[PDB]
């Protein structure tokens, strides 16, 4: 028989995320709280926060599906923490594969 077809959630954590749902200062402090070992680059990690949360994956009727995923390319001088940010996004996502 073949059938083709992760942190546990309590009722105390849902009260905390419902309490943090209507304040309009949430996004900046959540983008600033992901990597405190890296100075600066707030808008880049703002896009990285929007990147790891995802999209919607809309499937059209009787046609092709629509892309919900976002893709990010980062360039610059090799002096900063671009190679130090991949270890943080590999260890803090739901599931990630680095090559």
């Amino acid at each position: 028989t073949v059938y083709p077809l992760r942190q546990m959630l309590t009722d105390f954590d849902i009260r905390n995320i419902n309490k943090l749902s209507k304040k309009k200062d949430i996004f900046d402090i959540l983008s600033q709280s992901l990597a405190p070992s890296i100075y600066g680059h707030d808008h880049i990690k703002k896009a990285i926060l929007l990147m790891l949360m995802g999209g919607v994956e809309k499937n059209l009727e009787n046609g092709s599906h629509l892309r919900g995923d976002i893709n990010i390319l980062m360039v610059g001088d090799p002096s900063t923490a671009k190679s130090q940010l991949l270890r943080f996004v590999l260890n803090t996502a739901s599931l990630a594969i680095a090559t």
Partner: protein, 641 residues
Amino acid sequence: VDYNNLFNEITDFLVTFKQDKGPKYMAMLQKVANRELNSVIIDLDDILQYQNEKFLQGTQADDLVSAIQQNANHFTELFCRAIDNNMPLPTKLTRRYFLYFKPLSQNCARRYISSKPLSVRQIKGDFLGQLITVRGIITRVSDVKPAVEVIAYTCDQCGYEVFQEVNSRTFTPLSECTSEECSQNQTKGQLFMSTRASKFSAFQECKIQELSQQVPVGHIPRSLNIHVNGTLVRSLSPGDIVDVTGIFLLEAQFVRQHDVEERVMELITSGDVYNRLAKSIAPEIYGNLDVKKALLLLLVGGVDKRVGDGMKIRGDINVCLMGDPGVAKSQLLKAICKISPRGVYTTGKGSSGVGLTAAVMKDPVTDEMILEGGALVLADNGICCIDEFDKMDESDRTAIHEVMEQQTISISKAGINTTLNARTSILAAANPLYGRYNPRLSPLDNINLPAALLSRFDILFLMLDIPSRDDDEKLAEHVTYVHMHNKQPDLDFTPVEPSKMREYIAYAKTKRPVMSEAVNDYVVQAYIRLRQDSKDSKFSFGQATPRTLLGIIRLSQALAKLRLADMVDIDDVEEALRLVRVSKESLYQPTTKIFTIIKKMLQETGKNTLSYENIVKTVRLRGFTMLQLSNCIQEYSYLNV
């Protein structure tokens, strides 16, 4: 299942046939006794008629058609002996003939199943041993080679020549004597082989491929192997669609090659069929009705003309799409290949050099030199598209220009020196040298393609984007509307599904329009004026060629074919010339009555406007075309009015 009565039924069938000289099977045995033929064809229709004759007389049928369909390899060796039991005397191992089968059609199936058109994805595994009729294109074929069936050994010591039977791909030489005289003997003398008394067969392997519209969503057209023998060995020439009926071990036996009216009449009766079929295909993009209108005339094809004296001209169109990035290019190309059958998507670099021409390659299963194939051979009759046309090389261009000029490719390399035909329509998508356009540069310098390439190209579309204030909002509104939901905008028109216009294209393709003399005198005058105007500055590009005149004639034939008419009117040439002039116009970003009409128009505002949208509106309801008034504008300018 019994064999003792079924063999009696088989030997009683061939002597009691009167439904289709006289007893035709005995006449075929007399013909093979006259030594004129070597192929025996057995049909199931005669079996069905003999079964009907035996069932209507109250006799036992003892069904053959439900027994021939399973295990035909035992039946081709069992009924052959029943044919061998009776032969007429001639008047002019010992198998003089070759036995083959053919199934019954669907017309004999509805008139009192066994022969269904099967896919290679519809094989399931458990059909190994049923007779199957597969439909598909043929890409790989091999040469005819003699494969032995029985090995003949001769001896000088006894004289009894022995014969062994091989079944596999390989065998071993029987050096030990197994005769009836060497068993009771001390001596066991050497044996030799005979290449003359040994029976051979014209063996050939072929690779059948899955049909393009029969494959599922996302899947690729996988192949299958067919092993043919005997007289069927020259009935398979590559580059065609075939229906192969044979047993599945594939040992072929017979090959052949090639509600709806309500669906076409409800598409016709809505009014403005050409514009509805233009705006129906690819509605997820914004505007460009002219480019995609010529794409509609491109996939409808046109009329292939034969002079009947050894000269064939093209009845096809080839369209270029030169543009800057920002507007969608792969979507129109994908929609054309998804709507039209046999559409194959290609690329610029990669295996393209071997993906446009035959590529020699060793074959491991049979161990030999096979000739692989590109993208122009599986897509024989249809749309062949090229994405990133300027990213290719000279080897791709020299083969693309050869099928662009005339439909026969000839290749003479260390593998083969052969020819093959491929009626294809070339769709090309290209970009300039610096990505986008340049207004300070000439179009001969902006386009890196040579004069012989775009001189053969009749329609080149300069899809150039210009930033604006009003027109950009509609493209933004359209992409937000299609990204909000899958539905199209609320206009008073419904987008037609692929099957209905596919049926309309297949129904319009059988039409053969003939040009008149009144359109002939307009065609030659417009060609003379276009040649003189084209016959050298900053914004110029190319010159007027006779191939462009032939393409104008082909587009007029396609416009008459889309209107399902037997004749070519004056309305098609004036639309085609407007199409070919507005194809290049984006870079800048019978007369007295008309004169009287102009005067009537003046009797309101008294305006001498240069270009018209509301003067021409009172002309089309009367009976004159758009070309007659076009001359009335220029002529009259000599009246200074």
